[PDB]
User: Which sequence fits this backbone?
């Protein structure tokens, strides 16, 4: 797979993507 | 988390089970608190007596009624 | 013209104008300052 | 003057409750078409010596033109007017069960 | 046009997934339940 | 001639749906009693014909009328020919009036009776499972018991008021 | 000017004949809406 | 449909859960005799 | 309102300015504490492109918008009205506010295409030959994002991209 | 209803002719209501295996209205099958060439993807202008209401509504306008 | 195997058929499917899709009475949403209690 730090923005797990959407200012 | 769910008798879903509100039991609940729904047990008529064991019913409000008559309220 | 992603005026006689859905830079004094949004 | 639905097309609905409030009564009699909303049925549609005998008008039509005449008068496609083979004509149940 | 290289939902270049409105509401509904679970586990 | 909450008329000034005003509960309460007395007066005089009813039987709702049949998918423990009464009636309707339960109608207002005419098994049902490339295959046949009822009568009583 | 019967049909003559049949059923009381025959044991 | 509204009236989300519709017997003898309790 | 006129007599030209009757604001506004004509009448978030009686009070006889220092509008509402007037002209709702045609011009017959909620100028829009995939679809804009906070009476919010 | 068994069946499964006016109406909204009528989804007796569709007549398909910039942005793409036979025209180009294609293509895309669709399209009648043949005009039953409400131009308002709407600002008297 | 798995589709497609027929019968009276089903439950009327679809075909005068009831209960809900509790509940909004 891919390392935790990448030159490109790494795609999140869908559960995390939903979390970031609920926790928006 | 699968093992704790068995200890608490929560194999089948949407099946109310009653437990004691004590630290040891609560500790097991804090491990699977994202898989369950916790609600306090209410006793508007009080504890069931020996003559009411077969007349009880657990409502969705959390109340345990000891007189399940199944008839419209006259009020 | 010259296609530019960042338009910029090169003199006092350059003027911005939005035409055909994109931004342009025109200049009558120095026609080499003309730019097209890319 | 309040009415949930317009009481013009199907029936005159009048909802009601009982004194105890345990039964919903609904009086819905049918409305009749007025006489002014109708039309009269169109009933209406020489020196002859020879009785006009009935003349057959069965003109020959080829398969093609005949399917075009049938698909226009019934507003369909040409496909249903083409025949089917024996395999399918013998699979059809000629004595199907009839319900009322 | 519109090829995703390789398999869709794995690897470096994946097909993007977007959060709908009911997916947000579904998650918030779960949170409100577990937040009330913390309250009854506190007495 | 403008109040603090006055908005000049535009497309979005007021909702698109028309404003609705419900009847006065007091004046409406006595109008309901007139409709119940009218329908109740139609039952005493027998001013109705054939009746249909919606009964809840065997976890299932049946739209039934007189001299009709219904097929039940279980055994009832009743001899063929025994007459029973269907107790749960959600709806009983006529050509000109309809009665609804909340959710069930009273027993002193409608009486549906049926009769057992046949106790029989269903036709054999195939239960077979298969998974490719796993040597997984098994067959089972089941014949569920059945019971046929015939609705005998649907009669009502003037007990609305 | 009082509707007593109304019937459908493919033609205007078939519908006019079915309407008369509908009126006769109402006149004799042999409609479909008529209450079923009473088979209950005589009292 | 209606599950949340039923929960606000002290009822079950599913009308099959409890109450008169499911608990009461489904039939009885025409004479008036009661029927034996249902299995469920 | 002021008008200017030119009269030529004896090869001499005269230019004058004459005042004309001027409309007056209706009395007793609902919200006298409002800052611009919009909040004073409780019209904020309650008008659209099709409300021409409101839009006509802020444009010129030839379809042009009036300055903000004259009308007294706020920059937020002046931009909304400026965009709702653009979409009203394009929908054919202001047929008496057409541009001035110089002497000796007869507009050619052009395809009459009915349209509404037209954000962009027709001639400056190119066709979408490649729609794109479902996750990167090229949408067609409908309406204006400046009217996104308008009062919606439905459960589905204003869709601005088709 | 106390009818005979044959007439009762003929009435229930009868075909009705509907009328739609497309003037200043978006094709999709027109096609959404025309699509359910052609299948028979407005009938409680609906079943796919029952040919219970109705007839829809849409008039004034040349005066439809698109929202946004769809006349310029929207593209209809086809292929003749031959090399270099891929064509792409805008909605405006297609509308000037065929004034019934837009409404016909919108309905054809809303109908189920099956063999019955081509039969539903024979029961659809499109006319660019308000003229309709006598035969098709003698068998009409009902006119469906327009989905979109055509807004009024400023020249269509009466002097009452104009005076009813209040003036909001007081222009200066020294302004040239 | 197809016959064994088709017993799940039969039940599914039936409910899809009923809903389509209820939706059609509700639009004849200017209603939408969610407003009929949701507001009949609020009136304690527990009628399933199968029965409702049968009534729309064979008992049209009873189905209009049910749609008027749902529309009446729907309008009472809006009236209550405009008040702050002071106004009493509607006549058809009352709930029969079972102890
Ligand atoms: K990949
Ligand atoms: Mg790793
Ligand atoms: Mg791949
Ligand atoms: Zn320059």
Assistant:
């Amino acid at each position: 797979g891919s390392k935790a730090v990448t030159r490109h923005r790494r795609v999140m797990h869908f559960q995390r993507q939903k979390l970031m959407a609920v926790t928006e200012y | 988390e699968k093992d704790i769910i068995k200890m608490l008798g929560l194999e089948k879903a949407h099946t109310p089970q009653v437990h004691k509100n004590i630290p040891s039991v609560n500790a097991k609940l804090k491990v699977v608190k994202h898989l369950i729904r916790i609600k306090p047990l209410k006793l508007p008529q009080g504890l069931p007596a020996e003559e009411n064991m077969s007349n009880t019913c657990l409502k969705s409000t959390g109340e345990l009624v000891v007189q399940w008559h199944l008839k419209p309220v006259e009020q | 013209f010259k296609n530019k992603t960042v338009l910029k005026k090169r003199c006092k006689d350059c003027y911005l104008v939005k035409r055909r859905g994109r931004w342009y830079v025109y200049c009558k004094t120095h026609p080499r300052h003309k730019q097209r949004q890319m | 003057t309040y009415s949930p639905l317009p009481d013009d097309y199907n029936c005159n609905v009048e909802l009601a409750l009982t004194s105890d409030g345990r039964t919903i009564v609904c009086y819905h009699p049918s409305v009749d078409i007025p006489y002014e909303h109708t039309k009269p049925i169109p009933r209406p549609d020489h020196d002859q010596v020879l009785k006009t005998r009935l003349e057959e008008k069965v003109e020959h039509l080829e398969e093609g033109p005949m399917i075009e005449q049938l698909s226009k008068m019934f507003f369909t496609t040409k496909h249903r007017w083409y025949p089917h083979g024996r395999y399918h004509r013998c699979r059809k149940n000629l004595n199907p069960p009839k319900d009322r | 046009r519109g090829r995703i290289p390789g398999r869709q939902w794995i690897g470096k270049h994946r097909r993007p997934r977007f959060v709908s409105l009911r997916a947000k509401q579904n998650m918030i509904r779960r949170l409100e339940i577990e937040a009330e679970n913390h309250y009854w586990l506190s007495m | 001639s403008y109040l603090p909450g006055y908005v000049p008329k535009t497309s979005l000034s007021s909702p698109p749906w028309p404003e609705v005003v419900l009847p006065d509960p007091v004046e409406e309460t006595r109008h309901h009693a007139e409709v119940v007395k009218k329908v109740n007066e139609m039952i005493v005089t027998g001013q109705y014909g054939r009746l249909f009813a919606v009964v809840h039987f065997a976890s299932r709702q049946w739209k039934v009328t007189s001299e009709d049949l219904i097929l039940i998918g279980n055994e009832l423990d009743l001899a063929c020919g025994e007459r029973i009464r269907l107790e749960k009636v959600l709806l009983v309707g006529a050509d000109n009036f309809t009665l609804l339960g909340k959710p069930l109608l009273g027993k002193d207002l409608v009486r549906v009776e049926a009769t057992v005419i046949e106790k029989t098994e269903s036709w054999p049902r195939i239960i077979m499972r298969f998974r490719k490339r796993k040597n997984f295959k098994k067959k089972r046949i089941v014949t569920t018991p059945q019971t046929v009822l015939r609705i005998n009568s649907i009669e009502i009583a003037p007990c609305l008021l | 000017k009082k509707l007593i019967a109304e019937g459908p049909g493919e033609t205007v003559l078939v519908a006019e004949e079915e309407a008369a049949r509908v009126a006769l059923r109402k006149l004799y009381g042999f409609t479909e809406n008529r209450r079923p025959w009473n088979y209950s044991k005589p009292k | 449909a209606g599950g949340q509204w039923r929960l606000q009236q002290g009822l079950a989300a599913n009308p099959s859960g409890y109450g008169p519709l499911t608990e009461l017997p489904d039939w009885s003898y025409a004479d008036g005799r009661p029927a034996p309790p249902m299995k469920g | 309102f002021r008008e200017v006129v030119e009269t030529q007599e004896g090869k001499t030209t005269i230019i004058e300015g004459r005042i004309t009757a001027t409309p007056k604001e209706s009395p007793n506004p609902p919200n006298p504490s409002g800052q611009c004509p919009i909040c004073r009448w409780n019209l904020k978030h309650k008008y659209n492109y099709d409300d021409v009686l409101l839009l006509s009070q802020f444009i010129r006889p030839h379809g042009g918008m009036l300055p903000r220092k004259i009308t007294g509008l706020c920059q937020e509402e002046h931009r909304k009205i400026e965009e709702c007037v653009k979409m009203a002209h394009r929908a054919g709702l202001l047929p008496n506010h057409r541009p001035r045609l110089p002497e000796g011009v007869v507009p050619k017959s052009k395809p009459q295409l009915n349209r509404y909620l037209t954000r962009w100028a027709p001639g400056s829009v190119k066709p979408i030959y490649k729609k794109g995939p479902r996750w990167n679809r090229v949408r067609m804009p409908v309406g204006s994002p400046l009217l996104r906070d308008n009062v919606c009476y439905s459960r589905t919010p204003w869709k601005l991209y088709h | 209803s106390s009818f005979s068994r044959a007439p009762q069946q003929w009435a229930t499964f009868a075909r009705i002719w509907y009328l739609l006016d497309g003037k200043m109406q978006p094709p999709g909204k027109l096609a959404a209501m025309a699509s359910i009528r052609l299948q028979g989804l407005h009938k409680p007796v609906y079943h796919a295996l029952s040919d219970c569709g109705d007839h829809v007549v849409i008039m004034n398909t040349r005066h439809i209205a698109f929202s946004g910039n769809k006349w310029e942005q929207k593209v209809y793409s086809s292929h003749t099958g031959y090399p270099g036979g891929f064509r792409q025209v805008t909605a405006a180009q297609l509308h000037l060439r065929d004034p019934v294609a837009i409404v016909k293509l919108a309905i054809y895309g809303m109908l189920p993807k099956n063999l019955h669709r081509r039969t539903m399209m024979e029961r659809l009648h499109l006319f660019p202008d308000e003229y309709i043949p006598e035969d098709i005009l003698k068998n009409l039953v009902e006119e469906l209401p327009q989905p979109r409400k055509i807004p009024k131009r400023l020249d269509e308002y009466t002097q009452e509504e104009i005076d009813a709407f209040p003036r909001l600002w007081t222009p200066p008297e020294d302004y040239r306008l | 195997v197809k016959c064994t798995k088709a017993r799940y589709l039969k039940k599914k497609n039936m409910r899809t058929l009923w809903i389509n027929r209820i939706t059609a019968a509700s639009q004849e009276h200017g209603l939408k499917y969610p407003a009929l089903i949701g507001n009949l439950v609020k009136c304690q009327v527990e009628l399933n899709r199968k029965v409702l679809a049968d009534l729309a075909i064979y008992e049209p005068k009873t189905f209009k009475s049910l749609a008027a009831l749902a529309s009446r209960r729907r309008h009472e809900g809006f009236a209550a949403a405009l008040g702050d509790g002071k106004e009493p509940e509607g006549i058809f909004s009352r709930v029969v209690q079972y102890h």
The pocket of magnesium ion (ligand 2) is lined by residues A 1 (CB under 6 Å). The longest helix of chain G spans residues 12-28. DSSP finds one helix and no strands in chain G. The helical segments of chain G are 12-28.
